[PDB]
Amino acid sequence: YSGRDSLIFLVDASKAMFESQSEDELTPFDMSIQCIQSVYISKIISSDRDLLAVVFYGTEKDKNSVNFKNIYVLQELDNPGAKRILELDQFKGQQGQKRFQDMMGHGSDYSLSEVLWVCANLFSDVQFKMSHKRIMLFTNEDNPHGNDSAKASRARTKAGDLRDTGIFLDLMHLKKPGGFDISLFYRDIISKLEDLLRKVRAKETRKRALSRLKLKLNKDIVISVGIYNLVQKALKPPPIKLYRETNEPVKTKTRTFNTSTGGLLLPSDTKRSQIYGSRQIILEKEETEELKRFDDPGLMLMGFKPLVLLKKHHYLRPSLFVYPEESLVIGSSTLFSALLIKCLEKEVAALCRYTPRRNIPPYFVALVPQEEELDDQKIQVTPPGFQLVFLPFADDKRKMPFTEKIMATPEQVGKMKAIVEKLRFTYRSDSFENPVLQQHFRNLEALALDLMEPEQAVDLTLPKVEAMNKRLGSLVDEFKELVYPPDY
Amino acid sequence: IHWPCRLTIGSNLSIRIAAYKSILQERVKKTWTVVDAKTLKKEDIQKETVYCLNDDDETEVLKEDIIQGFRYGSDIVPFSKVDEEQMKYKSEGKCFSVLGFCKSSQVQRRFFMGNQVLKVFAARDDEAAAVALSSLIHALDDLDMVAIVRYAYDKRANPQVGVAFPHIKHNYECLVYVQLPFMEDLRQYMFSSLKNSKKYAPTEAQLNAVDALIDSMSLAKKDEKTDTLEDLFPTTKIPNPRFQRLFQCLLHRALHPREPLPPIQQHIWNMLNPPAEVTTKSQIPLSKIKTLFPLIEAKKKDQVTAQEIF
């Protein structure tokens, strides 16, 4: 199950947003435009599969297909592309606002029944499963007055109908943020605009669930668990192929050539070998593939190993989050509810032979019960399950000389304890993004609209400790009781 | 290998050091190379391609008449790495810029990226560095500290963060290093509560029989009153079975290729079995568990078709 998320944004046209908010600051129109650049960038950098359409109401002209009065669409339900961003961004500020108004409409009345009408009819046209659906609003009206109470009541009925349908309403204050001046009676028909503005960048999410793994703890019992890859790098957008000016990719006829015939290597004519001493030891890719067969894809459990005996010096591939499940074998999660309840003998690690893929050797792994740290705000921290650390082999070692050469004086430990105690970090995990990847993103948006570069910054990986030293006190230099400086 | 550098804290602290890549999986040392089948040399080994253009009419296009476009939303934005090299991210390299210090209680094994361990020690002509290093590792052990060090190997390398801690012991005061993640190095799926699963709660009889399994289980035993836990199957002394299997199989071809290469040999599996007493004493708990827990299975397995006619 994947689904989708349909998002539509509506703006009135009554000069209540074409106005400058009685300030040199951004207009409600302009702040909505910056919000929509933020939304479009966020959608592009995240899964862009979601469709976004542009529709405006309260307008002198009509280009909605239904052609009801005071409704003017611009964009169909499409993934936000570069051209969409340019065509919406060409209409902002005073000059963009006025040209947009003369090509769209400078402002007129609202017909709520008509707009709910057209939204239901349009959302009918979706041809795919819809995981979520939401409509965000940004309008200054406290409550419907211009429309008669008949239109307000029928809009209330349709609003209840759509709320039961699944779609929900969102709004923010416009006349004055904070307090309560908006939705006094929209309280019945039912900062934060900054979050709708540009706040979060380089987003991505996954709704998948890795395959059912079969615990081969013994020949008699094989059980079903759900593995889950919970950590991996986010990658570089692919250099998909193109052309100088026609802007068109290339295929490939990549095949190794043979001096004998004008043709290429035949799959027989290509033949594997290796120089061992005086031998071109002769094999094929088939033989090398056949060599690596050890046993079936799965975990061939050697057995439990008391986790009370454990070490931190060894390190390997980042861990894998296994989870209890009952997919194709019964009683699975019945016994999976066990082994997470005791930390005296059920915390015991599981030294296991684990083959992840067909035709793969067994790889040593160990189990850690990761108790659902269900955060107090319900945010199940360290979700309920298993942290799996892959165990070393006898080639994870390059020998090191002994460095136990000194155990220095207590004066040095005291001074550097004083030094380091003045700095402690709450360990915010999200505190540093990828500056390299974000800089590549910035190169992309530079090539997007017109910029030589839109943003020239680091993701805060640069050392602020040039100001921490005085914050900690320059005493770090006077706590050098060292007679000779190391860096000379 | 010896790798010298200078760690930095702020813009005033600089200590000449030396780094060594220590925990590195050894892989194939002679990566298999390709020859002809009827002559067994690189007399027929060449390449033919210029990456013909993808079109409606595929035109044989040069490798320089072409753009490395990029997936950008719903299109392919033209681009060349010559553009990157002039406004890409500019990494400094050969630096150990220490960004901060957090609580050792805050870092977790779940927050470890990478594959390896880097031992870092102060460079020579620096004895003050050595005494300060030992004293500061004492201080850090006292105060439960872990350092944030944005580290870059060289002009080639990007920021590679990580933390190294001293293995304080009578033996080497080595620096066990681990690479650290970012938020793009982590995901968080949804996992329903299980101990509350009424349909799937473990019965107390099954729980006690599972405890019987665990007691009958014994791999890291405890018989030494000197507080010594003895494991009878370590993983750090078993290298890639790829190497042993490759050698044993190769033996035939190196000597006489005609007959099939030797199998993986029962001895190799003998190095992959625990004390049989453990399995025997677990069998009674194993039997009582396999009787106390019901299972169902569906078979989607493969069969060998290279099959003996007898």
Binding site: R428, M468 | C102, Q188
Partner: peptide, 23 residues
């Protein structure tokens, strides 16, 4: 339930970066 990302409900509303703190 609250605490879920507005763009992708079911995944968490992650607070933005805050850098390193000095105590």
């Amino acid at each position: 339930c609250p605490g879920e990302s507005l763009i992708n409900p079911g995944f968490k509303s992650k607070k933005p970066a805050g850098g390193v703190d000095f105590d």
